[PDB]
């Protein structure tokens, strides 16, 4: 039985490829899809973060919808402590990236009257007044609900829908006036304190970057984070604002725009152009637009990001049930698998790792599934179609990448080794979706941390001093990658690898491609 | 904005098709994917069943893992009372099929402390003894557990793993005995009464069709059920055994083989050949094989069923969170959509409708997602590859079906109308995956109920007597489909449909095809 | 602006769309990839005419040993080499010219009647092996010299006489005679050729004369042999045997000439260095309306294998007497290039016709246009698919380099190679851009003409002590040749394939390099 779904890889049609998928075809050791974990009370201790890393976490997400700067600074400190506890062994060290996820223009309710834990039942057909009068800030109940969007009355009409608490409760505006709204409960439920509110179809006029966001973004620069997940990006100008706040000192932090509302989907092309990457933020997105349509936005967005070679993250509720249970549902395993087959560069966990009872088991399950799905891609067709979509470009690095991926397919190379300081060369290899892992050797630590955004890039930090001669400095970094591949079981002596280097120190990209036996 | 993802439909590559999927592109009214609902305490009343049918239920599944004949007989009676409550308006009446899901070779534990509702806690590392001594079948506790697989000692070895309660708890055998097994708790949890046991990698020698199964199958014949879902089918001879029990009296009942263990996957080709259809039974499957591999067998099974033209059902945990919540997770939305995109003829609900708090909402959600996903198929490529896979066959009805589908693509027909008594001609059209609905007019009531197994066949029962002139009997039945299509909003006057009919009374299949404007 | 090189058609999605986009106003590139093989004879064998042949595009000089003495052919070869080396003054413009020997091959011939006799349809005719009649052939009795004929023909079989003019049907079989009913009549002369359509002829692979002529080719240091009438792998093995140790590097091109050769093609191809579709004799053996089937089948399977394939015979036939070809002949050349032929050939057009240089020049012009009109992206995909069972390392370099050449529209692929193997593997994957193969082996350079797209460049410089210097020197030589011939100019991009170390064994290093 061929490994790595290689029988299916030889099919002539998508249907035949599907019919050849084999549960007894073992996947390879390397996992190409990056795993992003939201750190929270369930996973922010150093002891647990170490296990998070060993289980496969590549990026730690800090969710600034909650928490003080002091709280997040401590979480970040613990991540770095956990990560550096492994720098003893340079060959086995895994870099770990740090992401800041902005609050953005959120609408929330106030506190339920009584003591903190209270909940009121919103009954179907009952009426409920929404007020903006701060007098009710802390005495919400089933008759009057306060929220913090002072302009809501300007952007909703009679008939508008208001969704509350992750979309579980839906209200219809029956009467307006300024300072308040009268609504009817359509879908009831129990309501607690400080729940999120969505206004689908309304034109919310809160700023993309608020005063709080600016402070959090400045805090992110001071904490040396690697990337920002920008909430509720609606237009390119929103992205430009975030980049301005990060300014000169933060110019190398990647901006990932979260698509989570209708306008974001409508203006997707211009948002992608302006961004370093994209997150399919399915939670809000499935409230803002009909839930049955999210898969359409997900597949469209992943495809266009693959087309452009920009990282795309699939997020939210992938293993939701594992917040309470140690194994996922069948829908959840299928969801992770299909995000990988869709082409997602990374997959994400939120409550599963932030507050769940089984954060490690959830990480491990994403690792297992991603590997199975990675072998099940139809690489030959994917490569042809990606080459087609980019054939207007004659860029020399793209040519080097395509020739290298094509060579790697032909001789079934165990890996592609790429020497890069900005990461650009390795990003262009990943964009053409080789089957084998890309071992990217860099002396630039930020480049290594940010490489987890790209499917298949296994970053390796070189800490050796620069050698006197270029040939020796190149050979030094190539053999580091050989030793890393061996130690992790990506390949053994006598396997074949593709090696991409610069001919001279002044080559501006990896213009040299070799097919090399592993020593 | 073209409707029905028709812009994506005009794409040259899969990637381009993905990039063109548009959440603002309206799907058509008709939903092609059948919906199978498990009936239970939450869905068993006549009044609830009427809403189930209005929400989109096409097949009622009776799960014979539980309940007496008297109980299921009453359920079937209610389903038919509900169904026939709509016969007053023949143009809108919808056939509902009844399916019998066998218990099969299940393994179950006994009663905790004599109680159906009691639970004990199994802690990791504790000892736990499995006995077969019937003295303990109602005296399970945290020290001693009874189960009903008499030969379990024969088929398991020291070291073998044992899974309990939908695989949530795991034990490892440490010592064997004549009628007991001493084990250690590996994955702990709370253990209730009469829970399922799985023995992955064990030569379980239970009959495929037990003495209880034989009773249930003959009860199914008496109750005039339309189909049998056979549990744990391992090989073609298992199907033959089921077909034998159903006998001559039950020869027209479709046998759907449920694939839910490793052997069923390995022997799938012989099982498909012997079965009328297949169910991907993902619950047990993801316990019998590694859960991260289930998507592989799902896609392989659906593809091979599509190839053969035989109905395939995707089942289990598709909308699992809706047992307790009024809207699904994002993984559940994605799971349903991807099953439809894989090619599943039917999707199923189990706990969501048998016992959940939101059975109607679950059915409506499957309906909405299916419609969206059916338009998002890549019909032109699917047709080419289906045709390629079956090109060794020169069957005349396949020729008519492929020509009719091709014609329906070319002129964007609103429907295909197919006159059939056995269903065969309509099934051959369904197999080549038209975009438009297939209105199958038949005078055989059972053929109409069984048509729900096939993607896109909307059955219509003609109750008029056979006209003495063949041409007029054909016209009467085609005009019936015209009126039903108009009343249901599948098309309007001036739309175009493909019409498949027999040239003479003795034609054995629809050898005549016309393009016809709707009057 | 109109894209050159049929690059608009190149971007098409389907073959039909590619066809609909071919553009008479889209100019081809300067470099011509399809080799031209010219038969040298009385019309073309003076040194001064051979100089013009080379200038006009000839890559391979074919000597047809169906006629002429060793002395005659030795002088022709000498004239070819005298003409070739007259350009060796300038190493940047020197073109290698290869020498090919085409064997007479085994034959079946009739006896004597210069008398002529008319056979009439429906008449009876007896074929005898009795030497009594060897010089007494007439209306009723015909002698021929193939003494095993009765072993290989059946009742109902056909016997063709004089390049297919006469056809007979076997009605009765004797132990040493055949009675036949003349189907196609005509006038029958003396010592005429006989063909046995569909027969498994047991004639030797090489005749006595062929053995003498092959040994002569080894003494003359020819680059390749065109072996007539190859019917099975054992025929090719026999030719390699006669070439012996001194000629073990001479390439053997098998000529497919009859039914058995087509039917056993796979085994012949495995055993041969290359293939010639010998359409003249082929169309006498099989029905003329089926030759294109065999031609396309053979070119396809040779392409699949990466072995050279030549399209031969009557391509520009009318130019024997006329200074311009017919439209059927223009089409025929273009379609052979589109089919995938590595080389196209001229026989009488250059050996004896009135317009030998005109024919060479027309083949050159047609090939450049047809080379641009191939559907490279599809061809590459289909060649990749057919060879995907192989994981060979040099194919992977070839495929990645050709792929890189498509993506960045490289002006050329530069390959350093001593055996040529690395360049052959690049040619096999059909880049659009020319392949400049720099070699210090003069025979590799002459033999490279058999492969589509390889422009051989002979390096005459001593080996530099430092490997990096030796590689630079040879890459620069190719840079200089490319600029002088107008294949590229400063600022263009080329793919360069080299060995990492002297012992690398193949070109395991690929670079994208700007033209300096
Ligand atoms: K956030
Ligand atoms: K780089
Ligand atoms: K069951
Ligand atoms: K029928
Ligand atoms: K000859
Ligand atoms: K070589
Ligand atoms: Mg959000
Ligand atoms: Mg089951
Ligand atoms: Mg001949």
Residue numbers in the entry:
A (entry chain B), B (entry chain A): 12 to 530
C (entry chain C): 11 to 123, 128 to 530
Reported in the publication:
PYK catalyzes the last step in glycolysis and is present in all domains of life. Many PYK isozymes are homotetramers (left); a few PYK isozymes are homodimers. In most isozymes, each monomer comprises three domains (center). The PYK ‘A’ domain is a TIM barrel, the sequence of which is interrupted by the ‘B’ domain.
With our rM1PYK analysis, we also include three new rM1PYK structures that have not previously been published: the novel liganded states are (i) a 2.4-Å structure of the M1–PYK–Mg2+–Na+ complex, (ii) a 2.3-Å structure of the M1–PYK–Mg2+–pyruvate–K+ complex and (iii) a 2.2-Å structure in which the various subunit active sites are populated by either a phosphonate analogue of PEP or succinate in both the presence and absence of adenosine diphosphate (ADP). Next, we summarize a comparison of 61 subunits from eleven rM1PYK structures, which were determined under a variety of liganded states and solution conditions and can be compared to the H/DX-MS data. Side chains and backbones that showed >3.3 Å shifts were noted; the majority of the observed changes were >10 Å. Our rationale was that the differences among structures reflect the minimal structural ensemble, which in turn gives information about dynamics of this protein structure. The B domain appears to serve as a lid to the catalytic site, which is located on the top surface of a TIM barrel. The B domain is highly flexible and adopts many conformations in the various known crystal structures.
